[PDB]
Amino acid sequence: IETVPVKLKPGMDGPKVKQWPLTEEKIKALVEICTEMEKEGKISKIGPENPYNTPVFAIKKKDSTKWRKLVDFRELNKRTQDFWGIPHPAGLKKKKSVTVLDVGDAYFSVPLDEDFRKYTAFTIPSINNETPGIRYQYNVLPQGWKGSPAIFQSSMTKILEPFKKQNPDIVIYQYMDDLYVGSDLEIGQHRTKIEELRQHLLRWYELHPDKWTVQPIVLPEKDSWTVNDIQKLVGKLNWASQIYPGIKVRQLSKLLRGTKALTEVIPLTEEAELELAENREILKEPVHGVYYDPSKDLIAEIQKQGQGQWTYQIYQEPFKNLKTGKYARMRGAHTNDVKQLTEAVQKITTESIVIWGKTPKFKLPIQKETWETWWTEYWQATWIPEWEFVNTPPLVKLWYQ
Amino acid sequence: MVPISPIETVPVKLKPGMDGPKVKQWPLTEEKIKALVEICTEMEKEGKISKIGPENPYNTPVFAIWRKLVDFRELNKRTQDFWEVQLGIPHPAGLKKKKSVTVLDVGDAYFSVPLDEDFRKYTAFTIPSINNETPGIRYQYNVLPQGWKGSPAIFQSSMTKILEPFAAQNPDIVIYQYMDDLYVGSDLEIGQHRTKIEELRQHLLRWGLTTPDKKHQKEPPFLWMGYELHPDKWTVQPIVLPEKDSWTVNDIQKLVGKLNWASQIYPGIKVRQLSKLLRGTKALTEVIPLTEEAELELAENREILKEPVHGVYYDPSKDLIAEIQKQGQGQWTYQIYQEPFKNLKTGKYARMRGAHTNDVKQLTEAVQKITTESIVIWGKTPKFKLPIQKETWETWWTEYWQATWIPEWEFVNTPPLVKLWYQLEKEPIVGAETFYVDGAANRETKLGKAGYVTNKGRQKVVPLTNTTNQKTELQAIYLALQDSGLEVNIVTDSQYALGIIQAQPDKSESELVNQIIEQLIKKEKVYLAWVPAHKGIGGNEQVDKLV
Numbered sequence: 001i002e003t004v005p006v007k008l009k010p011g012m013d014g015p016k017v018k019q020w021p022l023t024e025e026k027i028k029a030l031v032e033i034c035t036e037m038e039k040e041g042k043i044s045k046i047g048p049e050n051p052y053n054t055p056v057f058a059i060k061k062k063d064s065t066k067w068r069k070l071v072d073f074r075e076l077n078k079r080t081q082d083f084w085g086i087p088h089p090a091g092l093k094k095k096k097s098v099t100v101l102d103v104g105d106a107y108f109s110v111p112l113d114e115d116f117r118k119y120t121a122f123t124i125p126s127i128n129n130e131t132p133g134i135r136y137q138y139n140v141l142p143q144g145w146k147g148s149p150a151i152f153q154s155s156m157t158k159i160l161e162p163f164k165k166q167n168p169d170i171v172i173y174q175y176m177d178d179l180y181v182g183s184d185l186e187i188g189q190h191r192t193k194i195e196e197l198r199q200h201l202l203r204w205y206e207l208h209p210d211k212w213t214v215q216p217i218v219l220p221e222k223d224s225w226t227v228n229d230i231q232k233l234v235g236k237l238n239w240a241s242q243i244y245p246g247i248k249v250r251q252l253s254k255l256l257r258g259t260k261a262l263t264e265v266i267p268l269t270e271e272a273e274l275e276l277a278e279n280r281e282i283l284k285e286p287v288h289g290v291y292y293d294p295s296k297d298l299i300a301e302i303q304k305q306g307q308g309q310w311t312y313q314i315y316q317e318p319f320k321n322l323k324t325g326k327y328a329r330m331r332g333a334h335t336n337d338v339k340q341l342t343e344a345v346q347k348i349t350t351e352s353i354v355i356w357g358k359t360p361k362f363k364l365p366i367q368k369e370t371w372e373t374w375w376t377e378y379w380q381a382t383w384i385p386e387w388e389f390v391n392t393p394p395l396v397k398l399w400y401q
Numbered sequence: 402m403v404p405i406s407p408i409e410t411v412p413v414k415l416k417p418g419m420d421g422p423k424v425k426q427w428p429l430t431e432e433k434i435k436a437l438v439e440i441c442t443e444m445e446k447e448g449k450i451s452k453i454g455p456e457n458p459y460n461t462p463v464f465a466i467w468r469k470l471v472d473f474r475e476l477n478k479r480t481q482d483f484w485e486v487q488l489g490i491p492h493p494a495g496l497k498k499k500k501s502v503t504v505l506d507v508g509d510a511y512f513s514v515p516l517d518e519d520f521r522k523y524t525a526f527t528i529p530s531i532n533n534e535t536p537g538i539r540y541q542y543n544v545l546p547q548g549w550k551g552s553p554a555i556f557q558s559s560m561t562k563i564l565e566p567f568a569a570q571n572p573d574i575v576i577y578q579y580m581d582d583l584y585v586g587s588d589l590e591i592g593q594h595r596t597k598i599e600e601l602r603q604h605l606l607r608w609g610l611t612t613p614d615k616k617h618q619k620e621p622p623f624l625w626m627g628y629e630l631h632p633d634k635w636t637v638q639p640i641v642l643p644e645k646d647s648w649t650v651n652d653i654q655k656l657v658g659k660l661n662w663a664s665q666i667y668p669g670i671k672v673r674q675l676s677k678l679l680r681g682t683k684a685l686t687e688v689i690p691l692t693e694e695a696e697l698e699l700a701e702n703r704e705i706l707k708e709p710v711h712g713v714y715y716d717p718s719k720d721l722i723a724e725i726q727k728q729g730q731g732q733w734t735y736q737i738y739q740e741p742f743k744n745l746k747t748g749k750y751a752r753m754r755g756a757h758t759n760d761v762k763q764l765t766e767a768v769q770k771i772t773t774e775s776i777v778i779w780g781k782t783p784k785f786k787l788p789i790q791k792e793t794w795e796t797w798w799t800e801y802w803q804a805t806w807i808p809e810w811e812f813v814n815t816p817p818l819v820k821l822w823y824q825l826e827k828e829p830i831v832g833a834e835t836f837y838v839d840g841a842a843n844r845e846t847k848l849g850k851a852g853y854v855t856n857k858g859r860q861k862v863v864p865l866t867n868t869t870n871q872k873t874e875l876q877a878i879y880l881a882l883q884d885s886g887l888e889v890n891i892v893t894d895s896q897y898a899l900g901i902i903q904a905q906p907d908k909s910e911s912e913l914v915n916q917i918i919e920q921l922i923k924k925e926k927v928y929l930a931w932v933p934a935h936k937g938i939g940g941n942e943q944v945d946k947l948v
């Protein structure tokens with residue numbers, strides 16, 4: 001009910017990001033939504049004296065046909081001054097289950113600092129540039145802005161204070177417009193407690209981290225090896241030697257002596273079996289000296305494996321993986337690779353939020369033009385991470401398969 | 402007097418830290434001075450400007466060309482940034498046919514909208530006195546000055562706010578604002594349409610805005626932004642390719658501008674060779690002789706631009722179709738239409754700058770471009786007709802290492818067809834010879850060797866001059882492809898060569914890569930396996946090529 005002054009970083013002007021084209025149905029949906037918000041005072045029309053702009057588009061979240069407005073506040077977020085911090089709950093990832101709630105509506109009851117409102121300007125575009133785009137700016141805390149949870153932190157603490165005092169075994173975390181609730185109860189008791197918390201929030205996404213862990217490097221177990229089998233094994237072991245120190249391949253490379261046909265069966269010598277066993281024992285141990293640095297960026301790499309299977313690795317220093325995973329979920333994206341990649345980016349980003357409380361920088365195995373043409377069609381999250389595009393096929397694809 | 406409705410002013414400031422302009426006034430001739438005194442006298446009588454005292458420290462130079470011309474370049478440098486909603490013009494193919502269409506230019510556009518009074522002091526200008534024996538006459542602007550940074554945006558926003566209630570209570574007409582002109586259109590009867598036009602110019606008159614009283618001075622066809630807009634069709638203004646003894650850089654750039662601009666409606670315009678003669682010239686006068694390829698491209702261009710071609714307007718009740726054809730040398734052409742032989746518009750796409758490429762990737766890129774353009778113009782993605790079989794696309798995207806997607810599309814059997822030229826095996830081939838290849842080069846002498854040893858005892862090492870490690874690795878693979886049967890397993894340690902081949906090109910800048918592609922096209926089955934180098938992997942002989 002009282003506005004807190006908000007400013008920008010020194011020497012940085014407001015965001016001036018071009019609005020990308022939208023389909024007619026998305027434009028109409030945004031017109032209806034923004035009209036309703038204007039009648040509620042959440043936004044107001046602006047004049048030509050406001051040169052700032054932030055992209056906007058429309059999505060449809062899970063289990064709902066209602067269009068939702070999504071603002072890409074990435075530029076404004078990185079241009080907004082740093083708000084200060086709460087240490088990340090290291091036990092949220094350890095809990096049995098976590099449910100994600102959308103508390104974005106609660107932001108619209110808190111007004112926004114007047115002098116800052118001109119920096120939240122956005123444009124509903126028109127088809128074929130026929131009429132001028134409808135320009136708005138926010139009067140309250142907008143969804144997607146990083147300052148909205150920081151400002152609403154006190155109010156949120158006051159709302160959740162009774163529930164937190166009632167259940168000390170439930171971990172509550174907040175990121176942007178989402179509230180992550182971790183517990184160890186039963187799925188039924190978990191859902192009933194989630195209804196309890198949502199009505200507690202009313203009068204004022206099942207996710208099980210325990211079913212995801214870190215994945216070791218495994219080697220084949222065969223009774224007969226071909227020249228090709230041993231060559232691939234030596235390739236993967238030589239690759240894993242960048243991660244594990246004591247990996248040695250000289251006794252297995254000793255078997256490849258001579259120009260043999262690739263399909264010829266080679267029996268393993270005793271030295272080769274011993275070397276392979278030592279390499280297994282080495283791979284069973286964790287990686288040496290792998291720590292998380294909150295002052296560094298998280299990097300996520302995704303490999304398309306085929307048949308709707310995807311692999312990923314979150315790290316900070318090369319060959320020092322903080323997390324690895326394999327997303328093979330099939331949900332109406334059998335014939336669309338881009339939808340699969342987008343849902344994979346969203347799941348990986350959610351996991352990163354749960355573990356470290358911030359989003360990683362993605363390396364996407366896709367051409368820029370394809371991704372930038374289609375990714376908003378399958379996006380369902382309220383945040384947006386950063387990404388770059390790898391245009392050279394990485395050789396380490398199968399070594400993660 | 403009927404009371405005029407006020408026009409809300411736009412608060413304007415200068416850029417942060419910057420101050421208003423202070424520029425010395427030019428010395429003008431006595432004739433020019435008298436002219437500017439008469440002009441500014443009439444303007445002050447009309448209320449556009451006002452005399453100011455000596456307290457104002459800002460000044461902007463003025464000229465007479467009589468017509469007054471104030472040079473606001475410094476104030477524009479110092480004025481804040483505005484939101485210019487004019488970023489790209491509407492494309493005629495996006496318009497919808499209207500039974501009646503009217504043009505209403507608003508006279509005294511910027512001079513009818515008031516200026517923020519706190520900002521008028523920065524528009525001050527002086528008229529020099531005769532013989533400079535009296536202080537020059539000081540003036541400031543009370544309205545939007547033509548030439549100032551904020552006049553178009555403020556004018557368009559004010560016009561939009563004025564037009565909003567009329568458009569709201571008239572959902573059966575469409576209004577477009579453009580500079581000092583308005584374009585209204587409707588499907589009503591001509592009498593009702595003219596009536597609603599009279600209502601519109603009345604509603605604009607309520608705010609003090611004037612429209613053409615006579616018969617509207619512009620009637621179809623309309624010539625606008627290089628276009629011809631006709632009652633039922635549209636096209637570009639005439640494109641004439643000239644005959645020339647010799648063509649220069651400016652002649653060739655004029656021609657490529659005519660061809661690029663004409664390619665949006667004339668199907669099949671090619672510009673690869675004519676624009677290829679501009680590869681790093683950077684000299685407007687440097688005459689460049691045309692290759693016979695460029696002259697042939699010119700002949701085809703004239704043959705297409707022989708007689709006029711028109712595009713139709715958009716009908717939202719019919720499907721939107723986009724068909725693509727391959728032209729060769731990275732050139733693609735496309736037509737967007739809703740009925741056969743009646744195009745909405747046309748266009749082309751050239752491949753990006755790359756060392757390696759294939760037809761499927763380029764077709765994908767062209768599909769993305771057409772998709773974005775279609776969303777811009779019509780607000781939807783069209784159904785595609787592509788010269789590629791369904792099975793070909795299926796194999797491509799299922800086996801491609803990157804993620805890729807094409808929107809809804811169907812196969813059209815119009816040669817040349819995009820196909821996959823080779824596919825590598827997933828597993829080693831039983832019964833096929835195994836070629837262990839390797840190559841190496843000396844960094845100083847540029848001498849190298851490339852070759853293979855096989856499981857059947859076949860061997861070859863070839864010496865090479867003026868080469869590199871990468872070239873000798875590719876050369877080794879090429880040698881194995883030349884000397885092997887229709888089915889072959891190849892073992893290399895070159896991460897470079899595997900990086901190239903796993904990108905699946907059908908065409909390359911390097912002649913060696915293209916020869917490798919030609920060898921792969923002739924093979925039945927090729928399995929390419931990679932091993933680490935210098936790891937004592939027998940067969941892979943780094944020492945055989947390091948001698």
Ligand SMILES: COC(=O)Cc1cc(Oc2ccccc2OCCn2ccc(=O)[nH]c2=O)c(C)c2cc(C#N)ccc12
Nearest residue numbers: 491496497498499575577584585586621623625630631632
């Ligand atoms: C700004 O909007 C545009 O750029 C499109 C645009 C639309 C327009 O006219 C229209 C006004 C309102 C709705 C649709 C319009 O055109 C529909 C298609 N068309 C076009 C011409 C014709 O006879 N008959 C038709 O059915 C006019 C008359 C324009 C005139 C000029 C000029 N001089 C420039 C652009 C114009």
